[PDB]
Design a binder for this molecule. Structure first.
Ligand SMILES: [Fe+3]
Ligand SMILES: [Fe+3]
Ligand SMILES: [Fe+3]
Ligand SMILES: [Fe+3]
Ligand SMILES: [Fe+3]
Ligand SMILES: [Fe+3]
Lengths: 165, 164, 164, 165, 165, 164
């Protein structure tokens, strides 16, 4: 099939681009806002976006017979003013990734292709998992104003569910 | 300093682009040319390029007080015909990386900055190490013609006092 | 060579005097500002200045046959008002020893003495390491004014492959 | 009390200066007289004098409420002509430190300050300890004229009591 | 480069020649001066020169693409008179190879070749290490007169840093 | 005695020169012909010829009271065209050293000297051992056409009561 091929290529390029953006966000969060463990958290997110999240698509292409494209273009020009807006930008990005995955799943169900449905269940789950992992950190900035308390909390976070994991 | 900052940003860019291209090459060698272990070898090169090679630059920028910029662009549309041409292409990329690092090191000695020289020693070592590791594989396609023998040798490869 | 000998004697006396000053600053920080873990931090810094930082100079002199000279003088009479100014003074001292070591290394290369270059690489690295260790604390006094929180952070506080 | 504070500051200064001078003597004994283990021995003495012997004074000042004063100015212009005169100079320095501690102890007991008397008992003991360990090495040079047997016995001393310990 | 190549070939040649002459010196020290442990010491220097000191040059040539050359010519025709002269000869040999390596490093730094500079750092360090490890043995023939004490010393030496070693 | 002395000195010199030439052949075999394990093999041979094969003679001289001489002159100019001619040249050198030691043993038995005979028995045995273990690699090149197969079996080679 070709429509599924296009959709999965799109998700592949999206994942790579978001990985790069998250890496830059983590460096600028550690270097300027003086919150190193927030940088650690976002760096873990970027490693996860650049690793299995695209290795799985590549392996599925090798496995069923589809064809792969690569064309990436990214440039970070503006940076949010403080850490709150930065974590909220990350939140919005993840929220959009969920919508993209839902579109892919609907398409796969429409073309009478059930291998792609079984394959995309994994992303359907991991999207909600990562979104809540990010929102739990977002909710810390609505609780305290001592930056070091937030630091200790995120440190304890950095240092498995049956249904969602 | 400023020249060193520019050079290190350009090196960050170069490493990111190499990593992405190597990932694509490894996929196309596994899927098309019927050689999985060559694909694993190239994929591990790609993970090496996308990991510490740039994490170190980022951490050094965090330490000494320099600025970072992220600006990437890449799209492959020219792929070789067999495996030998692919591995020779990889060889050429590695050699050019070696050249660029040499130029950075000379520039660093020119500015009387010695933390930069100390930092770049690591890349000066890793360049030749990686080039030798790739040439070891390029040598195989000139010693046989049966693909499965080459594959088994590469698998056994993927299974020094100075350079390590 | 005589000029490298004079530069190394300068570095020796500088380290000794810094060690004594840091010892007194640690006592003051623990006794007058009610921050014992900052005191243990500065005490570790003073021990590091009074130990290997001069052991290695004396050992090098024993090896290559250079004369040693012990002429020191220090007197601590004016101390800052609070912990922020104290840790900022520490920061400045380290930022200056960096430049001193850089001058030494340039002089070493300029007159064709390469064993001194290989020797001074150690200090070229340790300068940036110690500067980051101090800065990671000088930037804790901008995150919060609850002094006990800073104390707990320093408590939990007290290596990179390149900058080890 | 001011007399005890002055005397303890003086002793702090004295210990620091002895530490530095002993460091230089250890270097010159290793480098010019071909006796590395004599250097090890004197370097051990120097590291003692620069460590606990002033660590304790500063800590006691913290405990009871006195003030500290750093004022150090030492320099080396002259050195002995052989290892014998060197170790005899070391002996003289320790011998004087004993009398300094004795004066401080008399003063401490004259002013009804018994915590400081308890404190100075430690130095009263370690004075004789260090003096006897120095004399056990200065008396070797009255037993031989071959430097290498002295080296052997000093090595077996360094590498290897209920009242005085 | 051709200058780096000629210099490194010359160093290979120097190392093999020193290995041969040290081996002969060790035999003639054990047999004719009745000093077996001095013989073992010089033998270890010999095999150290004949091992890694040239294996590393051969390996660097295999890596970068230079070519090797083999040319040896050695004849030991006049041996020193006693043990003192022998140890002084080996001292001077090391003190010469030091500035040989220094000239190589100067040349490598002058020709915009940083791989070879990084390479020769190893020899820059080992030169001084071996020089001092030999000088601490030549220093023993001034300390005593009888041969067996020197023998005991060299024995406890051969029967066992962060920057230099 | 003196005849045995001169013969053993000639043998000492022979062994030294063989060891050096073998080290150079090993470098050539690894670099030009692309066969690293053959290079490791010849390197083991050279280490053997430069170690015990001569320290035994020096020990014997120490023991019975003969005198030692040193005279070495080695210069390699022409190397074979490929690995087969290389290994055959090594075979010839070994086959010659066997004859040399046989002549030494005959002379030692003619002079009615029996400690020298008892000593040279070791070389009489080890010559045949080494020659067999070189011949069984020589005949690999006359049994196949691929280089990777030969290389794998030599690798496994690298990984008796009478002759041991
Ligand atoms: Fe995920
Ligand atoms: Fe690498
Ligand atoms: Fe330090
Ligand atoms: Fe003591
Ligand atoms: Fe060595
Ligand atoms: Fe043999």
């Amino acid at each position: 099939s070709n429509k599924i091929n296009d959709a999965l290529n799109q998700h592949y390029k999206l994942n790579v681009e978001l990985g790069l953006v998250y890496a830059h966000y983590a460096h600028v969060a550690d270097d300027e806002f003086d919150m190193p463990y927030l940088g650690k958290f976002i760096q873990h997110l970027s490693e996860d976006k650049l690793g299995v999240h695209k290795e799985y698509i590549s392996d599925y292409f090798k496995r069923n017979g589809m064809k792969l494209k690569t064309d990436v273009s990214v440039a970070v020009k503006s940076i949010p003013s403080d850490a709150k807006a930065l974590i909220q930008e990350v939140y919005a990005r993840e929220n959009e990734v969920r919508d993209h995955v839902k579109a892919i799943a609907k398409l796969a169900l429409a073309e009478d292709d059930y291998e792609s449905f079984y394959f995309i269940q994994w992303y359907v789950r991991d999207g909600l998992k990562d979104l809540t992992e990010v929102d739990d950190v977002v909710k810390l900035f609505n609780s305290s104003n001592d930056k070091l308390i937030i630091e200790e909390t995120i440190k304890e976070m950095v240092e498995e569910h049956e249904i969602w994991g």
